[PDB]
Amino acid sequence: VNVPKTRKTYCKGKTCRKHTQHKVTQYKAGKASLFAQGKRRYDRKQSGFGGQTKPVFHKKAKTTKKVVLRLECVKCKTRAQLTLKRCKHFELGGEKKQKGQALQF
Amino acid sequence: ARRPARCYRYQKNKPYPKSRYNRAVPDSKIRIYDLGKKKATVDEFPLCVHLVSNELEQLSSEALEAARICANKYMTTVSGRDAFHLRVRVHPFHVLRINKQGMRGAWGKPHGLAARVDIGQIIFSVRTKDSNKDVVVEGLRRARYKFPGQQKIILSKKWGFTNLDRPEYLKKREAGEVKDDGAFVKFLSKKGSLENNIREFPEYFAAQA
Amino acid sequence: AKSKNHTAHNQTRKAHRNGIKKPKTYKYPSLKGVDPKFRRNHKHALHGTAKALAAAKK
Amino acid sequence: SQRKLQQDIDKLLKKVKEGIEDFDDIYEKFQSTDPSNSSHREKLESDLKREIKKLQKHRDQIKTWLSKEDVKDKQSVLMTNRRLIENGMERFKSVEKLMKTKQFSKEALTNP
């Protein structure tokens, strides 16, 4: 689906609680740091004899991830997240569809 | 093959016709439904003779075609081809089903086509002259054998196939409000337009005999 | 080992052995789901009429 | 089973990749034939025709897989190998037509 690079939405910042310009980007997940408590617990549990100790996922069923847009309001530099549904193809600020040109086969 | 009408006899299922949900059904074997001098007039054929049912059952399209053939052959061999008009008054619209492991997935393929007949429903109608009452009765007696269940010949006292018992129809004819159409008649009603009523029934609106 | 799927037999008999009797309506039904606009006013108006009745009673 | 299915996937995946490699090698030797060796031109045509026919069979298997077989994870790599096979097909079609075209045939006399 096509979504514009800019969007006027509500801002949660205390300096502006109104509609303000936001720039739109896509949320990419973090680096999954090594010192999170679950990772340290996993390392201690996996160390030793006993093999794999926690389940690992195999029965993948879905093909699509929901897309979620990081909106940064451009005056107070604040960030928000908006979730859009399962779409196979996703473009940020693509060319606008045009009503009524000659098709080009 | 050829399962009996004794196992396709009673009306056990809902009517299951040929529609967009039920395709690839075989055609019926009865294709002609009127027979004899079918272009004759009710002027020519006054007496009606009806083969009617007494049982709520299902008639095969085979039973219809076989009864029509045997009756036709008898009347043409005895009284000639132009002495009668025979019309079959039931149309086979019922797709019968055949099953052909176990009862899993038991919904069956189309096998046939049947005429669901009610009690007191006309199966066969023959219109003829007054002198051929005997031969039309024995032809419909042959029809009663190829047809299952119990059936009756009733001497229908309607002028031809139409309506309107013989004195009433005679009165209408001598009044002149009846126009001869192809194998039927048109009636004058007192509700139409005066101009088109004038141009379609001139004899009622004149002083003719 | 197939078995029975669904049946509504005996269910009405159980329900009417311990019947459907009533939803037990009261005076002053609950104001849950009534408009907050004019619900706030109902609060203020009851406060005012209680104050006025007490002041008239002295 | 899904494990057996994915094993057959990975096998045809590797076969398609090695077929693409040798088809590209035959294609580049064709473009560097030194076309005075017309017999070598025809021989390389027939060889890359055999390789592109093998890719045809692999692509039809990919068609059936993506249609009915519940690939369930790897539609991306199946589609990319389909696209690689089809661009090889159109390269073979262009080469094959190029040497088919007769120098005084009516199409070449109409439009160069």
């Binding site: - | - | 159980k14 459907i20 009797k21 939803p23 | -």
Partner: protein, 159 residues
Amino acid sequence: GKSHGYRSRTRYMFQRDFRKHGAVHLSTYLKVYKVGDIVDIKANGSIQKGMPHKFYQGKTGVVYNVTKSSVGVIINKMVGNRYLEKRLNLRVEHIKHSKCRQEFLERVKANAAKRAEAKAQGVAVQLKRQPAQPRESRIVSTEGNVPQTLAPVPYETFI
């Protein structure tokens, strides 16, 4: 395989009447509902917003809440061994008044009237309705009406 959606088995229920399609009229837009009234729920298929479920079609309830374009209706429904109270938010197109309730109002106005003149002149209040009492002794006149005799008809077939 099996479906239980919000409008499952609602084909003829949410069809319009014959020659009654199109816009719904300003009588049912301009009727006023106040808190505590008694209304009948019959859904209009043209207005898709605020439709009731198919269970509440043809159901009588008490309106308890009124808002910008809809009213809230209280409906008692039977699940299990008890009635449950349901609070529906329905548009005024799907909401209609109760002629039984209006007839009860005209009856209570008539009853208050009847007790007023009954108290004014001091006899025979007799307010409550009585069911259909057995008929009383009457005299019929043979003058101009001699009983004509009837017989069962024979069996003649008309076909």
